[PDB]
Structure 1
């Protein structure tokens, strides 16, 4: 496990250094990087929407399950687009931070599963029809 962990650290570091020069380790690393940046950008440009939602997540005694469903269903109520997909990831991120703040980091494993399930079951048909994650990479960069 020590040999495969070292291989993982090499891959992660090299992916990073390549991305700083506008190159990519792989198709997957290019997707991870563009999404990391689009998330940061969305959070900075929509600072007001981000801050209002995070205040509500902090205040609510409601379950992370309920907050997840309320927000995600409202977000995709009018359909799927790349910008809304970025906001979905940003929301997941905020929900995980809030869970850790409340000493409920166990909820992070649950949020990650709900995100992967929502992506696989409700976002993947639109994603594939619209060029896949490679098209998002091209649109963002």
Structure 2
């Protein structure tokens, strides 16, 4: 099994983080990223709607939409706010996909994200003090 455990850990990390306490280093990062997205998304909400309007997505053009916004996002380098946009963007893309009855893409997009994040942002992240840096300089 062990999926009882995933549930228990998830319920506890959530209950803990409400009180300011963080279950693992991973629980910390997940929380910092979630909070940063909600904050980015609310602050630059107009900037997001403009984005949705300009890109109809079909299962054949969804990747094109992805690579275009991503390559532009990291054109002349990397920072944390740009990394938040990256996450915020993919979350929005995933939501438009389910909205427009195209739920199949959701896992594709996640994979595109994972590979990009893994193969393209990780070296910058590892060289700028890892994920703990951004938890400690942006989180809270």
TM-score after normalising by structure 2: 0.94
Contact preservation (8 Å) 1:57, 1:95? no
- The change in CA–CA distance for 1:106 and 1:61 in structure 2 (over 3 A counts) is closer
Cα distance in 1, alignment partners of residues 18 and 61 from structure 2? 39
- For 1:80, what is the secondary structure of its paired residue? coil
- For 1:79, what is the secondary structure of its paired residue? coil
Greater mean deviation of Cα atoms: 68-77 or 43-52 = 43-52
Unaligned stretches of 5+ in structure 1?
none
Task: Report the Cα offset of residue 50 of structure 1.
Answer: 1.2
Task: Report the Cα offset of residue 57 of structure 1.
Answer: 3.4
* Residues 35-80 of structure 1: per-residue CA shift (max 9 Å, x gap): 0000000001111111111222347796110000000000001210
Contact preservation (8 Å) 1:39, 1:86? yes
Contact preservation (8 Å) 1:57, 1:98? no
Runs of 4+ in 1 over 3 A off after TM superposition: 57-62
Contact preservation (8 Å) 1:57, 1:67? yes
Contact preservation (8 Å) 2:32, 2:135? yes
* Residues 5-24 of structure 1: per-residue CA shift (max 9 Å, x gap): 21111000101011111111
* Residues 78-113 of structure 1: per-residue CA shift (max 9 Å, x gap): 210000000000000011001111111110110000
> RMSD over aligned Cα, in angstroms?
1.5
* Structure 1 counterpart of 2:44, from 43, 46, 52: 46
Unaligned stretches of 5+ in structure 2?
none
Asked if residue 107 in structure 1 is aligned to residue 105 in structure 2, the reply is: yes
